[PDB]
Amino acid sequence: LGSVKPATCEKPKFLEYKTCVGDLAVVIAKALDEFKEFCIVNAANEHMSHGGGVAKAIADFCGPDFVEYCADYVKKHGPQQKLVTPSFVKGIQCVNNVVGPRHGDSNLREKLVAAYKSVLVGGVVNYVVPVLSSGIFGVDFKISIDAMREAFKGCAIRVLLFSLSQEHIDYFDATCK
Amino acid sequence: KPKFLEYKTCVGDLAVVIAKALDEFKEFCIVNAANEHMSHGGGVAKAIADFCGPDFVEYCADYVKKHGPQQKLVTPSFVKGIQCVNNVVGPRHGDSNLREKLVAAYKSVLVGGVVNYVVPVLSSGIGVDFKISIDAMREAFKGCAIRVLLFSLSQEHIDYFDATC
Numbered sequence: 001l002g003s004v005k006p007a008t009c010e011k012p013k014f015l016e017y018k019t020c021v022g023d024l025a026v027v028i029a030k031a032l033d034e035f036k037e038f039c040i041v042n043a044a045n046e047h048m049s050h051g052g053g054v055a056k057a058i059a060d061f062c063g064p065d066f067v068e069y070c071a072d073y074v075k076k077h078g079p080q081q082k083l084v085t086p087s088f089v090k091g092i093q094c095v096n097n098v099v100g101p102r103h104g105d106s107n108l109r110e111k112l113v114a115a116y117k118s119v120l121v122g123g124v125v126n127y128v129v130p131v132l133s134s135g136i137f138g139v140d141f142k143i144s145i146d147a148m149r150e151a152f153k154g155c156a157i158r159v160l161l162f163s164l165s166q167e168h169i170d171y172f173d174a175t176c177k
Numbered sequence: 178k179p180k181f182l183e184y185k186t187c188v189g190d191l192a193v194v195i196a197k198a199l200d201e202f203k204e205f206c207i208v209n210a211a212n213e214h215m216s217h218g219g220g221v222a223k224a225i226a227d228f229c230g231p232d233f234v235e236y237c238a239d240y241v242k243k244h245g246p247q248q249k250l251v252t253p254s255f256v257k258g259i260q261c262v263n264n265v266v267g268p269r270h271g272d273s274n275l276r277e278k279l280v281a282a283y284k285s286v287l288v289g290g291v292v293n294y295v296v297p298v299l300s301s302g303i304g305v306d307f308k309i310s311i312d313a314m315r316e317a318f319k320g321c322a323i324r325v326l327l328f329s330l331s332q333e334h335i336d337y338f339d340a341t342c
Contacts, residue, residue, distance in 0.1 A: 022290020025251035029261035032236075032253040063243045090239065164289060 004084065004094050006123035009036035011156045017176070019169045020162040024057040027162040028092075031128045035158065037093050038126035041119050043135060044097035046079035053135040055097075062087050062095065070097070082118050093124050103138030112139070112147030119151070126158045131168050141168045149175055178292045182318055184342060185326040186335045191224040194328040198295045199258050202324065205293035207254065208286050210302065211264035213246035220302035225262065229254050233262065249285045260291055267299035267310070275305050276313045283317030293324045298334050307334050315341060 018034065020027045031038055042058045044050070048070035050059035059067055065088040073083065083097040098118055101111035115132050129148065133139035145161075145168070152159060161172055185201055187194045198205050209225050211217070215237035217226035226234050232255045240250060250264045265285050268278040282299055296314070301307045311327075311334070318325060327338055 020290065023251070023288055026261055026288055026290045029251065029253040032232075033255050033257075065243075088243070090235070 003122050004039075004124060007037050007093065007125050009125065011125045012158055013156070015152055015155050016158045017172075018158070018160045019172055020160060021166050021169045022162070022164070024054070024061055027128060027160070028061070031126075031160050032091050034160070035091070035126035035128075037091050038128055038158075038160075039093050039119075039121050039124040040087065040095050040128045041130060041132075042095050042097040043130045043132055043137075044083070044099050046081060046099050048074050048080065048083060048097055054130050058095065062089055062092075066095065084121055094121060096121055096127075098132060100133035100137055100144075101139065102133065108139065109143065109147060112144055113151050116148045116151030120155075120157070125156070126160075128160045128162060131161070131163055134163075134168070141165070142171055145172055145175060179322055179324055182321050183324045184338075185324070186338060187326060187328040188330070188332050188335045189328070190330065191221070191228055194295060194326070195228070195259075198293075198326055201326065202258075202293040202295075204258050204260055205295050205324075205326075206251075206260050206263050206286075206288060206291045208294060208296045209262050209264040210297050210299050211250070211266055213241075213248060213266050215241045215247065215250060215264060221297045222264075229256055229259075229262065237264065251288055261288065263288055263294075265299065268305065269300065271305060275300070276309050276316075279305075279310055279313030280317050283314045286317070287321065287323070292322070293326075295326045295328060298327070298329055298331075301329070301331075301334065307331075308337055311338050311341065 020030045043054050050056055069085050081099045085095050087095045098115050100115040101108055131141045131144045134141040134144050163169055187197050210221050236252045248266045252262045254262050265282050267282045268275050298307050298310045300310050329335055
């Protein structure tokens with residue numbers, strides 16, 4: 001519960017997508033120049049451990065404050081399927097730690113759509129989003145990306161989709177064809 | 178994205194280097210010859226900080242305040258066409274084995290998702306021999322499928338590289 005301070009930038013007229021392939025630092029570098037402020041989506045686990053993958057890069061980036069926040073929170077409240085936290089980085093309004101579904105889970109598409117829908121944070125119009133469930137969680141990046149387009153359709157936000165893999169971003173461009 | 182390593186050169190001040198890079202590359206990473214505390218008061222570091230501005234300066238300051246000194250730090254540039262700044266700490270003054278230090282420095286210029294780079298001669302300012310820096314760069318970039326624009330105020334440095342090609 002509670003709201004994050006609303007962004008000082010304005011919502012776009014329609015849904016806008018951007019992409020970035022590369023290391024987290026590259027992605028944030030793009031986002032800080034394109035977005036006045038933004039939410040970064042973390043591909044988390046329910047323990048908010050951040051031991052591997054992009055969760056590890058985001059944890060290392062945001063630093064000790066962020067690791068400590070998640071740690072104190074899970075100890076106090078237990079495991080979370082979603083946790084909107086501070087980032088402790090100027091320009092980064094919050095980190096939205098979303099736990100997506102895993103390979104083989106029943107009702108996969110519905111669970112993917114719901115995860116992306118949960119990305120949204122009141123007062124935030126710009127988002128930096130990974131391919132949820134496509135790392136350790138083992139879901140086909142294509143179905144995750146289709147889930148995203150379905151979740152965000154009609155939505156007045158800006159979304160920077162990012163990945164280490166050019167294939168993932170090439171596939172996104174093919175969704176725009 | 179190139180088939181294999183390509184080199185370009187530029188003698189000039191930062192404004193002329195960047196103008197050329199924007200034309201040749203469209204988009205690229207600029208390498209800063211930084212110190213570990215990311216203090217950009219002098220040399221190309223000053224040129225870059227002054228070009229990219231207060232957000233860049235504060236970004237670097239804030240990061241070192243949180244995480245300690247860095248030997249490599251990739252940051253926003255806050256400039257269209259410049260994908261990021263990669264601040265790379267070369268050796269000084271000295272410093273045992275330059276080179277291997279210089280080789281390790283140049284290798285660290287590489288960032289996932291960037292293929293075009295605008296690179297100074299590391300450790301050439303206020304100072305290590307430039308021929309060893311340039312030799313080190315050649316060794317580090319061998320086999321890399323990237324584009325490198327090497328730049329300097331000194332015609333002397335560019336000439337040594339051009340003979341090297």
